[PDB]
Amino acid sequence: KPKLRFIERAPLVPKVRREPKNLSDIRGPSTEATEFTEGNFAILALGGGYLHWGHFEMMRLTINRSMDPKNMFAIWRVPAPFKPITRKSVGHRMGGGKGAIDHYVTPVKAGRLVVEMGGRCEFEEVQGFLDQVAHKLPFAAKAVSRGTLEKMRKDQEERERNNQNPWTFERIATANMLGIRKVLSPYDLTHKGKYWGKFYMPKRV
Amino acid sequence: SKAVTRHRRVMHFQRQKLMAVTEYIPPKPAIHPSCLPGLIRLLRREIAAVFQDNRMIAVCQNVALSAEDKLLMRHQLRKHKILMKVFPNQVLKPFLEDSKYQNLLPLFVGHNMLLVSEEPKVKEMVRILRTVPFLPLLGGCIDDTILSRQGFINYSKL
Amino acid sequence: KAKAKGKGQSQTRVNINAALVEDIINLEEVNEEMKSVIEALKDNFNKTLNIRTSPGSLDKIAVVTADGKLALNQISQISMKSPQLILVNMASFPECTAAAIKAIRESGMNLNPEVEGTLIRVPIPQVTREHREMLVKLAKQNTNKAKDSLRKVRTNSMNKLKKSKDTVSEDTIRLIEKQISQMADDTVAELDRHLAVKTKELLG
RNA sequence: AAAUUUCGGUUGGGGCGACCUCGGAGCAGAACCCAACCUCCGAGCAGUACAUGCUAAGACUUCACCAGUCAAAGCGAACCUCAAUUGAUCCAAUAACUUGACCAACGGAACAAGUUACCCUAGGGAUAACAGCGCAAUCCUAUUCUAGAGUCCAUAUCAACAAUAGGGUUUACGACCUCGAUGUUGGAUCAGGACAUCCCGAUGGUGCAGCCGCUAUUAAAGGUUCGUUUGUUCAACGAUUAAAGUCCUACGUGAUCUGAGUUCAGACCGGAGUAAUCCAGGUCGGUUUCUAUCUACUUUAUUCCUCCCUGUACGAAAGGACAAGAG
RNA sequence: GAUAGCUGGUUGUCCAAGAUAGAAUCUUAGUUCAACUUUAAAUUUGCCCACAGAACCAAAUCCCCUUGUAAAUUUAACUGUUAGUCCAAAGAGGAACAGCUCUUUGGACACUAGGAAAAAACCUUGUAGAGAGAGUAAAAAAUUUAACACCCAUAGUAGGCCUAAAAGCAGCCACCAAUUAAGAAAGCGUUCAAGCUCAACACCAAAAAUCCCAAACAUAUAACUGAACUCCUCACACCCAAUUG
């Protein structure tokens, strides 16, 4: 079955407890599966965000449209919708309890994979719909593969190790040079100076 | 405003100053290196074999002939005992200069269909070349000896 | 020239609130009644009388023959001969031909088919503006009847809302009333669109 | 029928809906700590003795107080479990231990209702209806990969699922100065500005044989009708010209005007209400001030119709033009 | 001379200290306690403190000797504060919007000084006067992505299944191999074949309504200018709302 299985919202067990919208699930690197698995290409998420059922449907349609059913195969790398997003009625005073359930969504972090690819095909044969879906996503995406992933990682490592700038970001954050921690965040010390809410700074060290 | 936002939140003054001061500074090459300093073996073997078996090889400039014209030429060359050859020039120039054939060096250039042979073909070839409205025979090569079309037709008369 | 007030707000209020829809009162029932009225009006329009061209249009109902239903465009290769004459080529079924003739004779088009075993001829000389105006007036009367039915439905809904008004927030009552009014306006707009389409089909 | 009184509090303005005491889970993640019109689970108790007896060093203590919690021992017999699980003063019964609350408006007046558009007064934009202001949930405009139509033909044209940029013109959303006053819509004279341009000027394509058409760019120097109704811009219709365009101007302009009604006192119609009064229900009519102080101001080419072009180019026929001059 | 949680005001000079966790209240426009602050006095430990100590279902926090210091407890008084706003992070509801409503840690504003244009909340900086003195903290935005290596075509043939038909692209199979040296065909166009290319060989981002808004220069040597911050001659009690001494 070299095709993306059908995705549907509202799981078989809709949680009734209205959980609070937490932003920590978007901040930070992709703690979940980051490397490839039983494949060769993937869609590296260069920025946090969200994914709705329509997004998954459009991605599945675009993949099934241009894809060889006897030379490639893709596997889902994101679970089904679950995060309850309670949206109040457009036109009411602030207050009066919490809104009811509206739609589910699967959060995503930076450096997370969405859909994978396999088979004895080159990266150029995928590049098309790869970059297409990447531009469709609601966050900064880009076509990435094993070789290209390793290449960009080595390039980032070389840039970090050869940075002529005697002063870096972590060296100033952890050590607290000029007491700038008052503006910085507690998570910045754990991570690097490349994150900011959800975006990603691949050019910055 | 909340921590995470759909748009790019404006960073603090000190935050922006730190981000700008902690920018990446690549190296500065003082000189930059930009301003600093298989099948070919089979081709060579075939060219050497041809040179060793070129008792009466000819050279032309067959290019204006269509596919059907080339087929008709091959049929004519099969009628009277004689074969045709088509090899590159990049791999033939080194062997040309190495075989002491200096007169043939400036000849081979661009397009040229060689016609190797062994048996006498002085009249049939002349007729096959006259049947068309072209005379690309830019001096053949018999027993490794320089000779123009005049000498060729003279030997043919004999 | 905007006249575009809040409607998506009411739609979202109706979609989100589930307990209210389950208690006050039955949005599903209201929508079902509205759709049933719309379908009844559409049937009254496309089933009373109209110069419906193309044999595929007349292909509707016919008495069961030999324990098997049948229609026009099903087994016969019909071919429009002229606007004043239609051809028929049954599949060797005199009983089905007689059944179709009987079903067509009971129509309101005032036809006089000339059957000849398997061939049928249903000519139509021409139609003047009198029949068109009569059909337009009948469609207007049917639209008025549908409007009266929607009025009765909305009156029942308002009576229910009033019965359930004491121990209920007056704001929610007013919002439900506005939603019902918007639904009635949308239904009236759909009915007017259907009437205009029917008038265009009749005259055009 | 007379005599006194009241009509408790929260509500992202007030009523309505719901709540008014206490315990636990996340917010509050590792001494304590903190918010509920943020999402939940429970209780005004439940089962055996009656040493659940009399005394008393030291402590915790719901962020105060009142109220609550643990306890070496001393005398007397031995050879309680649970998490909220509740009730202060006065007063009453009681020879006297002891007891008395859905005071739940639960730190608790001994018992008190509905309306005021007939209202008065002290104040509040701490707190509303029109604005201004900020957002852009809703809409419009442009672009990005083509999904799908368009007879072959995604990109003449329409255009789903999404993202990227501009809007505060509609509905709200927040109440930030303006309730010791910003006079509320249309309709009259006057119009200033912006083009997401209806038309007069110029181009590219076209499902351009021509007009009639469609699309994209520039051009705002100008024009943008006459009337029948409902108070309502909006809302239907008759005839015009090439067109009867959108938006901001404190829903442009009431110290220029208007009262049709929108905020008032009376009445009527149906309803709510035992009654007074009310439907944000419908109409009968409802005093519109200003004597100018200041700032500022107060005199410079557009279109349509007609004539040679006429039935021309264009076809298969119908049909039917370009420019220029003149009235 | 009523009362009134309510509007208004509450008279000369100068010095000093001087911003609050919360609870109850027929209550959140008002009152009390607590907490902050002021005066006179008796006592000794007040803060960062170092090994360690402090739970099964990340920044952190408590005690903490030497060590910097001179601050802290109590007694007796009594007025004043007990509606806050913004910024960085954890957040909570809202639309992962609002100069949107509420907490936790720090700063600022209610208190002057030098700047970011006119700014409360942003950066730097506080003990108060003179001099026609000197040295410094914060302090001036940068930047223009799109061509392209454009030479050149025999055939076992229309391979087989269905397709009256797709033979090379309605659908499936293997995809050989002769041209001297390369597709049972990667696009375009055909009902269908016809025609045109290619793979390869031979040099090869912008738009809203009064009118756009600081003049302005790429080419004389990195250092200057820039406070009430520090220093220089003198003497110093002489820059906080309410309240207090």
Ligand SMILES: [Mg+2]
């Ligand atoms: Mg209240």
Ligand SMILES: [Mg+2]
């Ligand atoms: Mg205590």
Ligand SMILES: [Mg+2]
């Ligand atoms: Mg004991």
Ligand SMILES: [Mg+2]
């Ligand atoms: Mg209590």
Ligand SMILES: [Mg+2]
């Ligand atoms: Mg009580």
Ligand SMILES: [Mg+2]
């Ligand atoms: Mg009372």
Ligand SMILES: [Mg+2]
């Ligand atoms: Mg009255």
Ligand SMILES: [Mg+2]
């Ligand atoms: Mg307003």
Ligand SMILES: [Mg+2]
């Ligand atoms: Mg199509």
Ligand SMILES: [Mg+2]
């Ligand atoms: Mg306000």
Ligand SMILES: [Mg+2]
């Ligand atoms: Mg006011």
Ligand SMILES: [Mg+2]
């Ligand atoms: Mg007032």
Ligand SMILES: [Mg+2]
């Ligand atoms: Mg005033």
Ligand SMILES: [Mg+2]
């Ligand atoms: Mg324009």
Ligand SMILES: [Mg+2]
């Ligand atoms: Mg106005």
Ligand SMILES: [Mg+2]
């Ligand atoms: Mg005026």
